[PDB]
Design a protein around this ligand. Structure first.
Ligand SMILES: [Mg+2]
Ligand SMILES: [Mg+2]
Ligand SMILES: [Mg+2]
Ligand SMILES: [Mg+2]
Ligand SMILES: [Mg+2]
Ligand SMILES: [Mg+2]
Ligand SMILES: [Mg+2]
Ligand SMILES: [Mg+2]
Ligand SMILES: [Mg+2]
Ligand SMILES: [Mg+2]
Ligand SMILES: [Mg+2]
Ligand SMILES: [Mg+2]
Ligand SMILES: [Mg+2]
Ligand SMILES: [Mg+2]
Ligand SMILES: [Mg+2]
Ligand SMILES: [Mg+2]
Ligand SMILES: [Mg+2]
Ligand SMILES: [Mg+2]
Ligand SMILES: [Mg+2]
Ligand SMILES: [Mg+2]
Length: 48
RNA sequence: AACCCACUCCCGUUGAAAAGGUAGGGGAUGACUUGUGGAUCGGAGUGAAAGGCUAAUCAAGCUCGGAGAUAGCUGGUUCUC
């Protein structure tokens, strides 16, 4: 039990995904928003 | 003639010049031209009226704030399997 020897259980922590970083990441360019439209823009939210 | 203007042609258009020049042209004692100082201004002023002019900016000047106004619209969005 050292400070450089303890970690969390598998699956307890994930990494978050970052849109707009290259092609190989799978979330590049549009970043999961599809193409043009209201719900592809900054503040483009449909009211409840 | 000076002075004030700006009708025509040409040149110039990266100009000598962000509106000129050479030739010609109109008024030239008058509703004339001009120096100095002053007054009126932003939905306001001034206008022998062209929506003209208010510092090369005018169907509502410039500047700083509300303010990162709003943009169902264009553009862009970065390593790997
Ligand atoms: Mg994909
Ligand atoms: Mg998605
Ligand atoms: Mg696009
Ligand atoms: Mg579409
Ligand atoms: Mg869509
Ligand atoms: Mg926005
Ligand atoms: Mg003179
Ligand atoms: Mg001639
Ligand atoms: Mg002349
Ligand atoms: Mg003369
Ligand atoms: Mg006469
Ligand atoms: Mg006088
Ligand atoms: Mg005043
Ligand atoms: Mg105004
Ligand atoms: Mg008219
Ligand atoms: Mg000024
Ligand atoms: Mg002016
Ligand atoms: Mg506000
Ligand atoms: Mg903006
Ligand atoms: Mg296009």
């Amino acid at each position: 039990m050292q400070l450089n020897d303890l970690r969390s259980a598998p699956g307890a922590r994930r990494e978050k995904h970052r849109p707009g970083r290259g092609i190989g990441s799978g979330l590049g360019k549009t970043g999961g928003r599809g193409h043009k439209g209201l719900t592809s823009r900054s503040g483009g939210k449909v009211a409840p």
